[PDB]
CSV table of C-alpha atoms and ligand atoms in Angstrom, one decimal:
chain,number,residue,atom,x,y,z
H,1,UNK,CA,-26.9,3.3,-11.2
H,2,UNK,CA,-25.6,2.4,-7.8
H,3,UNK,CA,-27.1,5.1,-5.4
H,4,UNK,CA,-26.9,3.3,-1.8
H,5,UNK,CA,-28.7,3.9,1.6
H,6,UNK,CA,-25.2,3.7,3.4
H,7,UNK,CA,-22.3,6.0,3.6
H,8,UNK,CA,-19.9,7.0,6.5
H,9,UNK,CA,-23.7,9.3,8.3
H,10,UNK,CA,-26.0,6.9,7.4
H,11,UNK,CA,-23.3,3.2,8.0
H,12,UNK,CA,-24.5,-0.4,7.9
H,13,UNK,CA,-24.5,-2.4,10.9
H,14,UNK,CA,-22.6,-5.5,9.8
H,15,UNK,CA,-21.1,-7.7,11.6
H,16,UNK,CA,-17.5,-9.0,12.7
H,17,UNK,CA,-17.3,-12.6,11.3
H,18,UNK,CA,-13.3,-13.9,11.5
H,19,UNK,CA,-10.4,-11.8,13.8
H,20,UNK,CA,-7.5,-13.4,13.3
H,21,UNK,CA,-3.8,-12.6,14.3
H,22,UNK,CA,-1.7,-12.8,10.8
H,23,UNK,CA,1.7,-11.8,11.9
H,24,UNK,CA,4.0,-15.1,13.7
H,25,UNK,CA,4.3,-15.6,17.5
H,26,UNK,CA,7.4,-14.0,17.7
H,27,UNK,CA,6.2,-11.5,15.2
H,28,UNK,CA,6.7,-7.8,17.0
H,29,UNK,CA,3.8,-6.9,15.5
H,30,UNK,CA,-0.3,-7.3,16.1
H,31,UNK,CA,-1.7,-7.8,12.5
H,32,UNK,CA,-5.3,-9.3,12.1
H,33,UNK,CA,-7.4,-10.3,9.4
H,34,UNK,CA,-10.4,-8.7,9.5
H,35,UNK,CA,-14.1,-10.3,7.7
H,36,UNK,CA,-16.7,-8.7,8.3
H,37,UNK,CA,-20.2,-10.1,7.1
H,38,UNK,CA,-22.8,-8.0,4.8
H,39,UNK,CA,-25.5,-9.6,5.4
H,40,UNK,CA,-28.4,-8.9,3.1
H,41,UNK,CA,-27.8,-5.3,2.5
H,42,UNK,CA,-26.0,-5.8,-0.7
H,43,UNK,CA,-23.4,-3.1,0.1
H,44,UNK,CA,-21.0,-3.0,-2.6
H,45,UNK,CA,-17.2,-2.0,-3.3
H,46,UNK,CA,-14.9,-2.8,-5.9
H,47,UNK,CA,-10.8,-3.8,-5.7
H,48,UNK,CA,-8.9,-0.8,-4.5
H,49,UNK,CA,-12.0,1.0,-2.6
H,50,UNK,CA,-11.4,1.0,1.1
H,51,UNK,CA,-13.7,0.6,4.3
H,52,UNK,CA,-14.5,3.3,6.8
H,53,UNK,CA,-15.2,2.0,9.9
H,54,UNK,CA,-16.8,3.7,13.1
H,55,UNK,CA,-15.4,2.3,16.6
H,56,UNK,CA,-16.0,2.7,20.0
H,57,UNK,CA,-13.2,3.9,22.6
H,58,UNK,CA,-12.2,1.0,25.0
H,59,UNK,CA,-14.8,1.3,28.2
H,60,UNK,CA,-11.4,0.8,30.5
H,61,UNK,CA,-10.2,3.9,28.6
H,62,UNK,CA,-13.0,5.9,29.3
H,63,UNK,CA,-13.1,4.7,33.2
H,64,UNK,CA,-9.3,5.7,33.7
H,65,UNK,CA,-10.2,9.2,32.2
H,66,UNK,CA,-13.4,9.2,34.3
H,67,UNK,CA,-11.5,8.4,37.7
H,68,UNK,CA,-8.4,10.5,37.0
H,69,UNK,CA,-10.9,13.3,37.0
H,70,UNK,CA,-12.6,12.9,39.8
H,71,UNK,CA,-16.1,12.5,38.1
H,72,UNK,CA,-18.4,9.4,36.7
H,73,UNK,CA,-21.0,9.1,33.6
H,74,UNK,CA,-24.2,10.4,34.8
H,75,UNK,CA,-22.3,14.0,34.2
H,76,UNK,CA,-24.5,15.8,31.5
H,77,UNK,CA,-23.3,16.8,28.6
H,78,UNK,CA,-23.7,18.6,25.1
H,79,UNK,CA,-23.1,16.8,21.8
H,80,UNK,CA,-24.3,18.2,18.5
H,81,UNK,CA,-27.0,19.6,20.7
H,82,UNK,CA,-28.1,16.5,22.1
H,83,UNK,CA,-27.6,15.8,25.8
H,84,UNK,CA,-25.8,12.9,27.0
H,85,UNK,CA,-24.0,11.4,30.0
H,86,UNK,CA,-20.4,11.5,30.2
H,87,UNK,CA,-19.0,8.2,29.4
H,88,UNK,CA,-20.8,8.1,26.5
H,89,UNK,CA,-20.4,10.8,25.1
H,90,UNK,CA,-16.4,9.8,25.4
H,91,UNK,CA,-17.0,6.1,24.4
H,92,UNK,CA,-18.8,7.0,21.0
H,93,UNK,CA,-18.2,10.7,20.2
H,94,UNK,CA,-15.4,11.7,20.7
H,95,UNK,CA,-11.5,11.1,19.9
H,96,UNK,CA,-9.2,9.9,23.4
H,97,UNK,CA,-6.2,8.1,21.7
H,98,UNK,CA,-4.6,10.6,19.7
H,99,UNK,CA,-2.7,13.3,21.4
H,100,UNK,CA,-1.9,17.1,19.8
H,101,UNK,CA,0.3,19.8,20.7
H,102,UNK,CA,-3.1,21.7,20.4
H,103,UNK,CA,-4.7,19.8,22.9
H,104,UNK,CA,-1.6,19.6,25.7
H,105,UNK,CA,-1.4,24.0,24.7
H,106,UNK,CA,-5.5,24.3,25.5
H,107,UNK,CA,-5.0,21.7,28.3
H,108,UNK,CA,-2.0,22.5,29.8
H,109,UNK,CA,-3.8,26.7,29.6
H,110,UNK,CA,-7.2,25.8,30.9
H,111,UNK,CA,-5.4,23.6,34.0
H,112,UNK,CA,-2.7,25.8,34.7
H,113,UNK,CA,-0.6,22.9,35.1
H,114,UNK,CA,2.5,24.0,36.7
H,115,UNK,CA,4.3,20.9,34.8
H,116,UNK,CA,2.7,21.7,31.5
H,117,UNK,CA,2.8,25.9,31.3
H,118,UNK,CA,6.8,25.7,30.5
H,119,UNK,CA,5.6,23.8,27.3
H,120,UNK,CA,2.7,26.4,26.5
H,121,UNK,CA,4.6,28.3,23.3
H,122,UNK,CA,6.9,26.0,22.6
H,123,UNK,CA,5.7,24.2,19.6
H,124,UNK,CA,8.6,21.5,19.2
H,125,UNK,CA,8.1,20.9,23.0
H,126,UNK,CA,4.2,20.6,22.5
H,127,UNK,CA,4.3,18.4,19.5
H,128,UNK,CA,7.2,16.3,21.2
H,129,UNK,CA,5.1,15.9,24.4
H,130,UNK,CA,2.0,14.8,22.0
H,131,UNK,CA,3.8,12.6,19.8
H,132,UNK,CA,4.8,10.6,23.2
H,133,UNK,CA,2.0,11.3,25.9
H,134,UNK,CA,-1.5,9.9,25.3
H,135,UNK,CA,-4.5,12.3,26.9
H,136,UNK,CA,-4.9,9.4,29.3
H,137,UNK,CA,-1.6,10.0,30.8
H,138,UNK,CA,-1.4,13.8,30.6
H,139,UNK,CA,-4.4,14.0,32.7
H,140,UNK,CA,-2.3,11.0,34.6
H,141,UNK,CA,0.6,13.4,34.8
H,142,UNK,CA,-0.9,16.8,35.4
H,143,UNK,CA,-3.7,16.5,37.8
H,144,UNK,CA,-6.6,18.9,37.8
H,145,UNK,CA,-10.4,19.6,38.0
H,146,UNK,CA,-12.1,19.4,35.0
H,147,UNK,CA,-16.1,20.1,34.7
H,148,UNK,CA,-17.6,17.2,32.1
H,149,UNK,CA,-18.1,20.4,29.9
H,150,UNK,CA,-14.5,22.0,29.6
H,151,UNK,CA,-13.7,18.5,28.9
H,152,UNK,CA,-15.6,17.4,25.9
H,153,UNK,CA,-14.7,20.9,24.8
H,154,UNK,CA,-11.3,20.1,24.7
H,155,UNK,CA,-11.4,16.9,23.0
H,156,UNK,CA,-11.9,16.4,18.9
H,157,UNK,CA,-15.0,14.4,17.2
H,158,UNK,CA,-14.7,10.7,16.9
H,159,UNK,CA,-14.1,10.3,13.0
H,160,UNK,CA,-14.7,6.7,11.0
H,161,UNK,CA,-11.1,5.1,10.0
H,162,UNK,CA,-10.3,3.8,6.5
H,163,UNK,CA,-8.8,0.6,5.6
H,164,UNK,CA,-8.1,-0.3,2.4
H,165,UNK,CA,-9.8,-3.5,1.5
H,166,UNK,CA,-8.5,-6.8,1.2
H,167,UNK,CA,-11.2,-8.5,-0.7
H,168,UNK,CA,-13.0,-8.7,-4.3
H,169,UNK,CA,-16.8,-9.6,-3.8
H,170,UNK,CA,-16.6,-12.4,-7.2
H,171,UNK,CA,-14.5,-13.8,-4.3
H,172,UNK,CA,-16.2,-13.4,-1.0
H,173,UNK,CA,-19.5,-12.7,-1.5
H,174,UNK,CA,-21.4,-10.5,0.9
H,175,UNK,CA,-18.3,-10.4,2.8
H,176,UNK,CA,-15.5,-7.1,3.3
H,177,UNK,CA,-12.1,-7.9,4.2
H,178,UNK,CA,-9.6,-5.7,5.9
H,179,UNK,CA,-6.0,-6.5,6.9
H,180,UNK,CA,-5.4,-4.5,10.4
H,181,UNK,CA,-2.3,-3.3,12.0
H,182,UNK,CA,-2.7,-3.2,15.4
H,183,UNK,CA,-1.5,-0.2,17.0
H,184,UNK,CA,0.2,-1.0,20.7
H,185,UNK,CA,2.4,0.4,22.8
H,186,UNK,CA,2.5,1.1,26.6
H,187,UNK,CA,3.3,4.2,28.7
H,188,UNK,CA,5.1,3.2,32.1
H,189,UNK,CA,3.3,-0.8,31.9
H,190,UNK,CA,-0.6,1.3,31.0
H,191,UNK,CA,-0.9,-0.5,28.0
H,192,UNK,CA,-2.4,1.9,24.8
H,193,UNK,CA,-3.9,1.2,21.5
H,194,UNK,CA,-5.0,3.0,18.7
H,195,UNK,CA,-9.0,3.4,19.0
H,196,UNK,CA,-10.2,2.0,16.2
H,197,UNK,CA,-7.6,-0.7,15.6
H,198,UNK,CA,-7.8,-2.1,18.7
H,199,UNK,CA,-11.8,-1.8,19.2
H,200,UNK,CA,-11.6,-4.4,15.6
H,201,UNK,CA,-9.2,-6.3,17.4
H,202,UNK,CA,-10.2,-6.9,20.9
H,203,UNK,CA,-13.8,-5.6,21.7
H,204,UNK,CA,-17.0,-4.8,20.1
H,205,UNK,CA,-16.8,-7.2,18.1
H,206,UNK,CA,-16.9,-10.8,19.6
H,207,UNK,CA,-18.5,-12.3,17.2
H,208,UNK,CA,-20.4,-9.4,16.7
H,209,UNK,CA,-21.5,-5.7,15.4
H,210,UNK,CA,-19.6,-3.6,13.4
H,211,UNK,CA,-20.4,0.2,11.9
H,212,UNK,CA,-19.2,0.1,8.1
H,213,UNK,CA,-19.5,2.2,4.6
H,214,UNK,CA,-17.5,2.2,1.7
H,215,UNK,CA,-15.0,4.8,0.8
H,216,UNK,CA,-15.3,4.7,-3.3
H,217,UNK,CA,-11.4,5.4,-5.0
H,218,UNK,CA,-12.0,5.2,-8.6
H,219,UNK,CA,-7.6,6.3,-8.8
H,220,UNK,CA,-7.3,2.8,-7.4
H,221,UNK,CA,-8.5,0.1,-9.8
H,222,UNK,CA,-7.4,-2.9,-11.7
H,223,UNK,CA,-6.7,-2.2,-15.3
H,224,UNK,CA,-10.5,-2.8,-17.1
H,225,UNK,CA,-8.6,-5.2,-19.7
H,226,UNK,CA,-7.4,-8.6,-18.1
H,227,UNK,CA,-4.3,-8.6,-20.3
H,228,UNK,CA,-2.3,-5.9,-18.6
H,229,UNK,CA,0.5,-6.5,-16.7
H,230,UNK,CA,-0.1,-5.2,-13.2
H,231,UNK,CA,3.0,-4.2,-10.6
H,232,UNK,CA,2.4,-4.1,-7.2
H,233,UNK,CA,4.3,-2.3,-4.5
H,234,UNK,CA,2.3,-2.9,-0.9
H,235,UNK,CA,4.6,-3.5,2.5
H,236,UNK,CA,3.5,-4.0,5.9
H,237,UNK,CA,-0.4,-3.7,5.5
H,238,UNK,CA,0.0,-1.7,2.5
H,239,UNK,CA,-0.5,-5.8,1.2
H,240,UNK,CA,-4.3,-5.3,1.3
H,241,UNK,CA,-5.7,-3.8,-1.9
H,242,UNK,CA,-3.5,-6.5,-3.7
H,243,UNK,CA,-4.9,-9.6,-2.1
H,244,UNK,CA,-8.1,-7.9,-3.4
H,245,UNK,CA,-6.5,-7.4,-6.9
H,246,UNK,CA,-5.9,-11.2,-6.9
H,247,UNK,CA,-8.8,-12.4,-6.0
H,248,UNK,CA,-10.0,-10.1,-8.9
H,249,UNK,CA,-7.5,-11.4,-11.1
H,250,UNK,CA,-8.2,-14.9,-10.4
H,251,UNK,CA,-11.8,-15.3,-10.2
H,252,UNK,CA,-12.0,-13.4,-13.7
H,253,UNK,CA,-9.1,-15.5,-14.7
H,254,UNK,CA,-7.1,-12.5,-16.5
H,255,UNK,CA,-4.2,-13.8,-18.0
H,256,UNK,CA,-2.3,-10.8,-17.7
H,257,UNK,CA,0.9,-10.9,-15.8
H,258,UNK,CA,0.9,-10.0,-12.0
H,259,UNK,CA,3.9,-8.7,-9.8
H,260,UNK,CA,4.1,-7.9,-6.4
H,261,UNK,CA,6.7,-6.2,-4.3
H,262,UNK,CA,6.5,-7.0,-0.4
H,263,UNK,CA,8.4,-6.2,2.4
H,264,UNK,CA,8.1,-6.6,6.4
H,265,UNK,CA,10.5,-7.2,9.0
H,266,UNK,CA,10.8,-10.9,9.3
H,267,UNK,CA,10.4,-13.8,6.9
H,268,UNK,CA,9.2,-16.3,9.1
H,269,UNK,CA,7.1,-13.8,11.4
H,270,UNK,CA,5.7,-11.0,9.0
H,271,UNK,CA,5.0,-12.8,5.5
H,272,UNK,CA,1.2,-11.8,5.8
H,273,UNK,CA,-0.8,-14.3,3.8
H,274,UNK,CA,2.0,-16.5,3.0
H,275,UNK,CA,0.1,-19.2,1.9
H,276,UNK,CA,-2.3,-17.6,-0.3
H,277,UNK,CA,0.6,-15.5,-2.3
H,278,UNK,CA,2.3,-19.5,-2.5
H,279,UNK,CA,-0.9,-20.5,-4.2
H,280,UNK,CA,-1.2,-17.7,-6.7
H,281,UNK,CA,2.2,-18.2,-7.9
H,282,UNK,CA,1.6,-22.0,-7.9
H,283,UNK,CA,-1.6,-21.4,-10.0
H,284,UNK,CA,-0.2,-19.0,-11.9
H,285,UNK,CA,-2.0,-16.0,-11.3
H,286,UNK,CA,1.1,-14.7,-9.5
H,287,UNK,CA,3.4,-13.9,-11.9
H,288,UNK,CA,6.6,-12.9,-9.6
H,289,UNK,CA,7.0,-12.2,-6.4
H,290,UNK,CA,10.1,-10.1,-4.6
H,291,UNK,CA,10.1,-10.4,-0.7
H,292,UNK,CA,12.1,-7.2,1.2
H,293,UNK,CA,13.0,-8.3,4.7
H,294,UNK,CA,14.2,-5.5,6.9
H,295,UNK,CA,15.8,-7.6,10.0
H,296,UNK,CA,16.6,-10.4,9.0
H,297,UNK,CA,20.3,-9.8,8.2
H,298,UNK,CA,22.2,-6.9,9.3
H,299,UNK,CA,21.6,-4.8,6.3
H,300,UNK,CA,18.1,-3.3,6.1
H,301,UNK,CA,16.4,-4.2,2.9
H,302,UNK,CA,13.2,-2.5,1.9
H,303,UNK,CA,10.9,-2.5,-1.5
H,304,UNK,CA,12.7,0.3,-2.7
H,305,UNK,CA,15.6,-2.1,-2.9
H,306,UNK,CA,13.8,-4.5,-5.3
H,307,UNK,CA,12.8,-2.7,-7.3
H,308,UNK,CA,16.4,-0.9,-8.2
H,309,UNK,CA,17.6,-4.5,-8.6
H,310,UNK,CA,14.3,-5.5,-10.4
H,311,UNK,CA,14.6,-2.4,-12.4
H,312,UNK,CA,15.7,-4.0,-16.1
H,313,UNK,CA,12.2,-6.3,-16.3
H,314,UNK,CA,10.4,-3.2,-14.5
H,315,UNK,CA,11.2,-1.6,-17.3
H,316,UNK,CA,10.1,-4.0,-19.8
H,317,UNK,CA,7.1,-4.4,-18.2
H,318,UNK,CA,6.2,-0.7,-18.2
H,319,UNK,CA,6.7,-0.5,-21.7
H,320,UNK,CA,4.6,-3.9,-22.1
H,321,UNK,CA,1.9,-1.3,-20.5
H,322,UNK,CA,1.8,-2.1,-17.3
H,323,UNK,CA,-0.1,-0.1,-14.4
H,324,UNK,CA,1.9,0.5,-11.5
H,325,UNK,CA,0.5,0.4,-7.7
H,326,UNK,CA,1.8,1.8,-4.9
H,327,UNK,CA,-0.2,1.5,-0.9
H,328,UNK,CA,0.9,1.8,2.1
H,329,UNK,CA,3.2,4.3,4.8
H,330,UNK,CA,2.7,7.4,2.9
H,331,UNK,CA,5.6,8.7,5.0
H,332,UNK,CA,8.9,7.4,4.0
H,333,UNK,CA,8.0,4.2,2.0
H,334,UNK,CA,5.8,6.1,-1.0
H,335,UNK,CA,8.8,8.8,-0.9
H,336,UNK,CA,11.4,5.7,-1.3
H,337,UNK,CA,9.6,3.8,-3.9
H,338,UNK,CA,8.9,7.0,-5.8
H,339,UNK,CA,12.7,8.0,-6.2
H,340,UNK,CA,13.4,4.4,-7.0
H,341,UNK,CA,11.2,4.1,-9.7
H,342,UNK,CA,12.5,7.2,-11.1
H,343,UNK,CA,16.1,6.1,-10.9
H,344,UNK,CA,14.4,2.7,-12.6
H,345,UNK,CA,13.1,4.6,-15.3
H,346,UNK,CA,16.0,7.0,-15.9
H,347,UNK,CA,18.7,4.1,-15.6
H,348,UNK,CA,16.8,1.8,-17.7
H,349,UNK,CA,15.2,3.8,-19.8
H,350,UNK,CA,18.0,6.2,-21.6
H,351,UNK,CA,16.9,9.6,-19.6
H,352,UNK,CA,18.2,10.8,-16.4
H,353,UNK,CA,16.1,13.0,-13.9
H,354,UNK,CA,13.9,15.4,-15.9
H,355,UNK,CA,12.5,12.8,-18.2
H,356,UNK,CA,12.1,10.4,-15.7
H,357,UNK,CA,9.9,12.6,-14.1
H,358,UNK,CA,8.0,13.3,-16.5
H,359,UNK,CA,7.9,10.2,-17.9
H,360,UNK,CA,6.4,8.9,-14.2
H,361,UNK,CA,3.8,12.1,-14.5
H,362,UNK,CA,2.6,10.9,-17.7
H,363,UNK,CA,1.8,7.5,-16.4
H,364,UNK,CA,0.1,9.0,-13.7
H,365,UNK,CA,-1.7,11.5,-15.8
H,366,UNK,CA,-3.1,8.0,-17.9
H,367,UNK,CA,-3.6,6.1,-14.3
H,368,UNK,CA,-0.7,3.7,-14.6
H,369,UNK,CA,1.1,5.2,-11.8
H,370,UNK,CA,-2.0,4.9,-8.5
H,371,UNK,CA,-1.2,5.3,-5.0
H,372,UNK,CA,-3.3,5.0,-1.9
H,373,UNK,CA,-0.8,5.8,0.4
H,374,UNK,CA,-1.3,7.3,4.4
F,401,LIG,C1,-6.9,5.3,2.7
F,401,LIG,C2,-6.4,4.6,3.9
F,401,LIG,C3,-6.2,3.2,3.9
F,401,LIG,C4,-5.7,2.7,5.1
F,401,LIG,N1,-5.5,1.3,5.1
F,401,LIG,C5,-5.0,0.7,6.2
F,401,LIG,C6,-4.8,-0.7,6.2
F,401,LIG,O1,-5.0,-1.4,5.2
F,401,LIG,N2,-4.4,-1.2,7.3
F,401,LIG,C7,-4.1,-0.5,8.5
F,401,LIG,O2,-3.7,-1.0,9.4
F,401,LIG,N3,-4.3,0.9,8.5
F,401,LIG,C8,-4.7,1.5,7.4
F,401,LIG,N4,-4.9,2.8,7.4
F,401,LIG,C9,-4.6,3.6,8.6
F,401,LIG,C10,-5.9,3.5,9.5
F,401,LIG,O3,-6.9,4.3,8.9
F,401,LIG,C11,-5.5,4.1,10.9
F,401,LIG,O4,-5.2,5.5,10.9
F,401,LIG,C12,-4.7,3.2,11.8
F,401,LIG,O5,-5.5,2.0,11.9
F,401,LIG,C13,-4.5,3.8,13.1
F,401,LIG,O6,-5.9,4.1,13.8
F,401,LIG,P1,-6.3,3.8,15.2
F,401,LIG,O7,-7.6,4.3,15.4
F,401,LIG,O8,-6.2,2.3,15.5
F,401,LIG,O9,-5.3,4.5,16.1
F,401,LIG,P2,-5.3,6.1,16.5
F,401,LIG,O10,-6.0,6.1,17.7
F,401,LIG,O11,-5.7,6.9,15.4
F,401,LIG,O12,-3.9,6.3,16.8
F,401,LIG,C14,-2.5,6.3,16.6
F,401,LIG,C15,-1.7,7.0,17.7
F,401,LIG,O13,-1.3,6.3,18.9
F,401,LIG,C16,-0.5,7.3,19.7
F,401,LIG,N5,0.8,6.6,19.6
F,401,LIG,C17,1.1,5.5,18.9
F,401,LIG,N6,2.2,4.8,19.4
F,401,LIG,C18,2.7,5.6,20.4
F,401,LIG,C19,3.8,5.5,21.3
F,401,LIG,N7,4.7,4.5,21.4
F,401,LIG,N8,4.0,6.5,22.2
F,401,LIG,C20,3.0,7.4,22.4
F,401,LIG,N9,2.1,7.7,21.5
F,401,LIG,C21,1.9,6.7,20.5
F,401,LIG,C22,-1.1,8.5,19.3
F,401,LIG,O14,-0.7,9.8,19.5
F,401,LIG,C23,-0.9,8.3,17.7
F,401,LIG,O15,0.5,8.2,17.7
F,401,LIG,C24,-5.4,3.4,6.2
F,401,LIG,C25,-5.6,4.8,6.2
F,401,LIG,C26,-6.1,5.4,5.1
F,401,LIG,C27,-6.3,6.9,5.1
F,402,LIG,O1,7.6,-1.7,9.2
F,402,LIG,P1,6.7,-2.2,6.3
F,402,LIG,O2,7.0,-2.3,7.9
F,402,LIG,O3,7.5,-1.8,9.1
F,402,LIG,O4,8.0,-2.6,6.0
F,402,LIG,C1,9.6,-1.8,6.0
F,402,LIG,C2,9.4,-3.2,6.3
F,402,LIG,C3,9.8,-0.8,7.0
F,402,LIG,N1,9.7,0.4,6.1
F,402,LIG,C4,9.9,1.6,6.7
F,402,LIG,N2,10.4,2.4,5.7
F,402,LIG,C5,10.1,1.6,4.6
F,402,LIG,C6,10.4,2.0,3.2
F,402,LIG,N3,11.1,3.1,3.0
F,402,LIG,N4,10.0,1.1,2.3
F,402,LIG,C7,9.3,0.1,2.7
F,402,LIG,N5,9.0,-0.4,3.9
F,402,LIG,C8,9.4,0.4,4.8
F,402,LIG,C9,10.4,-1.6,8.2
F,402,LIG,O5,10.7,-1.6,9.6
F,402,LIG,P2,12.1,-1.7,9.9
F,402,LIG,O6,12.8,-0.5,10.0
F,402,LIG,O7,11.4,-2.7,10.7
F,402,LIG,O8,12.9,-2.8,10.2
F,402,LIG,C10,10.3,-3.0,7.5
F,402,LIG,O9,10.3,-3.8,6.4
């Protein structure tokens, strides 16, 4: 019933319509606002769905890469059978900003680097030297001659990113939005990015043309049934699925009660899209709010926190039926909120540990418990 030309082989060429920095000017971080434009196409997506998007390596990247190894474009080579120069084969095909112990191991073996052979074996060392060494500086670091070939041989496929999106089309209309954290960092003043974050945020596009498709997740929606209170759990840019819930939520005008839990480092810096949650709340549509600072006093206070000292009306709600949502750093913020949800439910509810637990897998099994966490 909805079929689509469009998907991640096969993308629409939209176009980049707003790129604006989100997070204050003493913020620590890079967040932008992403719109992209949909033109005619009629792509469509629903609340909870997120956006793959191809990207281009930064040209200066490629360059750097080029000159470190004594070569330039113009150097033939093989991709998916085709035949293509060099630097763009690097530019569009394949992956340059994330490191692996894999690809130090095959590198530092097909070099002979006599600075990276004591790491070849040593996985700790390997991952260790990935986690903190782009391929940029590596090559930087451990000179050698590489053919274009052995190269591209080493390196892994340029693949699409995901970000969940921030919108609801009875909102926007032919319109995607995305909420973008910007990877940065530097490696002895070279400053780095992540690929695709950074090719969103400062090149193709001005603007300007973007690569898109839709990544359906049908264990991410709004409850069908605008009466259901809805609890939201999104730090950092886990945020954007639940500014597209609430546009959802407003332009149907549900009634039902709306929560969310946010955190970020600073108040005054990091609130992303501080003025829009104000007018929810002041419209109603935004039920309550609870804001998790991290640095802005001493003690480090995270989601997990408000919701053990939310956890009396979290339970009342959940028993009013509502759907809990959890997105974001799959890492150590899904693992916190998880535990403290559980020591919600067992405190509140009369239970301890076993029962919580399955009282949390119940409401998963029945899609009231839905993460999109990464
Ligand atoms: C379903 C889903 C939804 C998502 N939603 C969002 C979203 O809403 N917003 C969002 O921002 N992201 C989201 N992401 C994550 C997003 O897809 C990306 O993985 C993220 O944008 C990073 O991609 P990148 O291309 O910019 O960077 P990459 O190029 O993939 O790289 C990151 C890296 O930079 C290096 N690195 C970083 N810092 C340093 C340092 N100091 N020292 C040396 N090495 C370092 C690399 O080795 C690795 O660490 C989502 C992911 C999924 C799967
Ligand atoms: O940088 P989301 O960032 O950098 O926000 C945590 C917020 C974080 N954070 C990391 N662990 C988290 C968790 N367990 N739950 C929620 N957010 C988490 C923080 O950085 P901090 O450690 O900045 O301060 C900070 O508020």
């Amino acid at each position: 019933i909805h079929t689509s030309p469009y998907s991640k082989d096969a993308p629409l060429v939209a176009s980049l319509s707003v790129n604006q920095k989100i997070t204050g000017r003493n913020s620590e971080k890079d967040v932008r606002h992403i719109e992209i434009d949909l033109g005619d196409s009629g792509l469509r997506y629903q609340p909870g769905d997120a956006l793959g998007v191809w990207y281009q390596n930064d040209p200066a990247l490629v360059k750097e890469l080029v000159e470190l190894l004594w070569l330039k474009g113009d150097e033939p080579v093989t991709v998916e059978g085709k035949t293509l120069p060099l630097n763009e084969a690097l530019q569009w095909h394949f992956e340059l900003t994330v490191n692996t112990a894999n690809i130090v191991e095959n590198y530092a073996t097909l070099t002979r680097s006599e600075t990276l052979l004591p790491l070849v074996g040593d996985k700790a060392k390997l991952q260790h030297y990935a986690a903190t060494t782009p391929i940029v500086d590596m090559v930087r670091f451990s000179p050698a001659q590489l053919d274009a070939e052995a190269l591209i041989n080493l390196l892994r496929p340029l693949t699409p990113r995901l970000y969940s999106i921030a919108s609801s089309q009875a909102e926007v209309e032919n319109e995607v939005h995305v909420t973008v954290g910007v990877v940065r960092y530097d490696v002895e003043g070279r400053a780095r990015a992540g690929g695709a974050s950074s090719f969103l945020a400062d090149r193709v596009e001005e603007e300007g043309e973007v690569r898109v498709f839709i990544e359906h997740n049908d264990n991410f929606r709004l409850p069908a049934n605008p009466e259901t209170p809805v609890i939201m759990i999104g730090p950092g840019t886990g945020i954007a699925p639940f500014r597209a819930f609430m546009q959802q939520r407003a332009a149907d005008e549900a009634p039902g009660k709306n929560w969310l839990f946010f955190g970020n480092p600073h108040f005054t810096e990091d609130f992303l899209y501080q003025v829009e949650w104000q007018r929810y709340v002041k419209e109603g549509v935004l039920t309550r709010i609870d804001l998790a600072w991290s640095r802005d006093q001493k003690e480090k206070v995270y989601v997990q926190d408000k919701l053990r000292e939310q956890g009396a009306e979290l339970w009342r709600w959940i028993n009013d039926g509502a759907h809990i949502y959890v997105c974001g750093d799959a890492n150590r913020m899904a693992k916190d909120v998880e535990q403290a949800l559980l020591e919600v439910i067992a405190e509140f509810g009369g239970m301890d540990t076993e029962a919580a637990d399955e009282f949390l897998s119940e409401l998963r099994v029945e899609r009231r418990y839905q993460r999109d966490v990464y």
